[PDB]
RNA sequence: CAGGUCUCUCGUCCGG
RNA sequence: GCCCGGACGAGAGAC
């Protein structure tokens, strides 16, 4: 992905949009009980903890477009992936405006608690004004659709979230793209039946984990993988995609029956954004925040991964590839062992910076011991070895609990962390409860017992 | 009061 | 006891 032009948004007829400049993250009652290296991310240029120019750091991720032409291997990839999705029998119809708006089986309703983007954002108009869940009223949305049309610009925002130290000092904050309510509606009418199919089918046919529940899906994953594993994350995924990959995606869509609306994908591939005063244009790069972000990322991953095998391993049989993606996050297997360092080296030709799934510095051999998917480890149960724990490191849970966006959420927050931490086992779970209860507010919370969570887990099978 | 697209789960409240 | 559905809030995860 690459920035085409930044100019005062005054010159282009666009309003100045000014986001909040303050973190909503105050430190938690458990701030000193537990340790951690994470602070809220840099939101503005005037941040003391910055050791670099902010605005140059945030947009740093637009590294350019390596390729623009779907090569022969991308084409065999496209062929094989799209052949996979055929079996799903994915309904290819437009989805009616009422469902695009208020949800249907496999597709949730639009989030009435997040903004309506451009232009509503600068009119002081919100989704609640336009949408009505009780009534499922599509009338005022249609009127807005007629009036403002689609292909509206996205409003860039810095994500208010916890960041490492180097990420605060290097102003490496994450930026989302606030899709307009019009395009979310437009995109979901076009693609809603595809999003639903994906949601309903996490696994190796779709190559996607969107729609999974790790408590239950971890027990499935090993039975779905072939004998030898490899795995990756990527560096700056969305913005490291060059136009070639969008044409490859357009190509998958056409082959599965979405030919007519493949144009929308061009509006993703060439997008306009509003950022504070500026107005800028991007070519390549996934507009994270647009409808389908997750699904298109994971789909492009499946292509990227087939492509790189075909190039690196002559005669590789993609029919014995098994892979699951959640955006750039991927776990994959093949009947014979493949080399992630090599695969990652070809990936650079296509503009991809690839890594170990833990953002570790160097690729190891990947075993059912070191492999991680979505930050979690895999550990067989000791009584029931076919049932597998999603084991997230206590380090992570520690980092979270030390902060709050609002003190009145402590019960839910900590309670939620308990449902992650007990997979580390009774001995580690009870130490957790001890530390939590080491403070007076801790002794106020209703926390679940190891044994209760264990029987819940087993019962849920 | 400002900050996207989603998935999953938990919690609160209301239903069949 | 067991299903199932809705509204709202939170946490985690991907971008
Ligand atoms: Mn990444
Ligand atoms: Mn990732
Ligand atoms: Zn443009």
From TrEMBL:
Mn(2+) 2 binds at residues 233, 328-329. It comes from the Viruses. Zn(2+) 2 binds at residues 272, 281. Zn(2+) 1 binds at residues 270, 272, 281. DCTP binds at residues 163, 174, 236, 238. It is found in: Host cytoplasmic vesicle membrane; Host nucleus; Virion. Residues 227-342 form the RdRp catalytic domain. Mn(2+) 1 binds at residues 233-234, 328. Signal peptide: none annotated. Viral protein genome-linked: acts as a primer for viral RNA replication and remains covalently bound to viral genomic RNA. VPg is uridylylated prior to priming replication into VPg-pUpU. The oriI viral genomic sequence may act as a template for this. The VPg-pUpU is then used as primer on the genomic RNA poly(A) by the RNA-dependent RNA polymerase to replicate the viral genome. Capsid protein VP0: Component of immature procapsids, which is cleaved into capsid proteins VP4 and VP2 after maturation. Allows the capsid to remain inactive before the maturation step. Belongs to the picornaviruses polyprotein family. Homodimer. Interacts with host GBF1. Interacts (via GOLD domain) with host ACBD3 (via GOLD domain); this interaction allows the formation of a viral protein 3A/ACBD3 heterotetramer with a 2:2 stoichiometry, which will stimulate the recruitment of host PI4KB in order to synthesize PI4P at the viral RNA replication sites. This is Genome polyprotein. It comes from Poliovirus 1. The lineage of its organism: Viruses, Riboviria, Orthornavirae, Pisuviricota, Pisoniviricetes. The chain holds residues 1749 to 2209 of 2209 of the full protein.
């Amino acid at each position: 992905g690459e920035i085409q032009w930044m100019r005062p948004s005054k010159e282009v007829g666009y309003p100045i949009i000014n986001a909040p400049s303050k973190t909503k993250l105050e430190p938690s009652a458990f701030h000193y009980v537990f340790e951690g290296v994470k602070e809220p991310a840099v939101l503005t240029k005037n941040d003391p903890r910055l050791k670099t120019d902010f605005e140059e750091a945030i947009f740093s991720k637009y590294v350019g477009n390596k390729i623009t032409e779907v090569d022969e291997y991308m084409k065999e990839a496209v062929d094989h992936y799209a052949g996979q999705l055929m079996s799903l029998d994915i309904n290819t119809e437009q989805m009616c405006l009422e469902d695009a708006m208020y949800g249907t089986d496999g597709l949730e309703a639009l989030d009435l608690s997040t903004s309506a983007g451009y232009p509503y954002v600068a009119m002081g108009k919100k989704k609640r004004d336009i949408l009505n869940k009780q009534t499922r009223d599509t009338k005022e949305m249609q009127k807005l659709l007629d009036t403002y049309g689609i292909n509206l610009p996205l409003v860039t925002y810095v994500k208010d979230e916890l960041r490492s130290k180097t990420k605060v000092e290097q102003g490496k904050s994450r930026l989302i793209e606030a899709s307009s309510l019009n395009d979310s509606v437009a995109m979901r009418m076009a693609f809603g039946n595809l999003y639903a199919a994906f949601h309903k089918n996490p696994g190796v046919i779709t190559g996607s984990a969107v729609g999974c529940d790790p408590d239950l899906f971890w027990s499935k994953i090993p039975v779905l993988m072939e004998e030898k594993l490899f795995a990756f994350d990527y560096t700056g995924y969305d913005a490291s995609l060059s136009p070639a990959w969008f044409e490859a995606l357009k190509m998958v869509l056409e082959k599965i029956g979405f030919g007519d609306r493949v144009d929308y994908i061009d509006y993703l591939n060439h997008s306009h954004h509003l950022y504070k005063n500026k107005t800028y244009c991007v070519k390549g790069g996934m507009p994270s925040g647009c409808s389908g972000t997750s699904i298109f990322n994971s789909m492009i991953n499946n292509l990227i991964i087939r492509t790189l095998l075909l190039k690196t391993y002559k005669g590789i049989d993609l029919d014995h590839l098994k892979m699951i993606a959640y955006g750039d996050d991927v776990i994959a297997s093949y009947p014979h062992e493949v080399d992630a360092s090599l695969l990652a080296q070809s990936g650079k030709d296509y503009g991809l910076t690839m890594t170990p799934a833990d953002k570790s510095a160097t690729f190891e051999t990947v075993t059912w011991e070191n492999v991680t998917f979505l930050k979690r480890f895999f550990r067989a149960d000791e009584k029931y070895p076919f049932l597998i724990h999603p084991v997230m490191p206590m380090k992570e849970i520690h980092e979270s609990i030390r902060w709050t966006k609002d003190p009145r959420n402590t019960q839910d927050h900590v309670r939620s962390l308990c449902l992650l931490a007990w997979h580390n086992g009774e001995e580690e779970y009870n130490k957790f409860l001890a530390k939590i209860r080491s403070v007076p507010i801790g002794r106020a919370l209703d926390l679940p017992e190891y044994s209760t969570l264990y029987r819940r887990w087993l019962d849920s099978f």
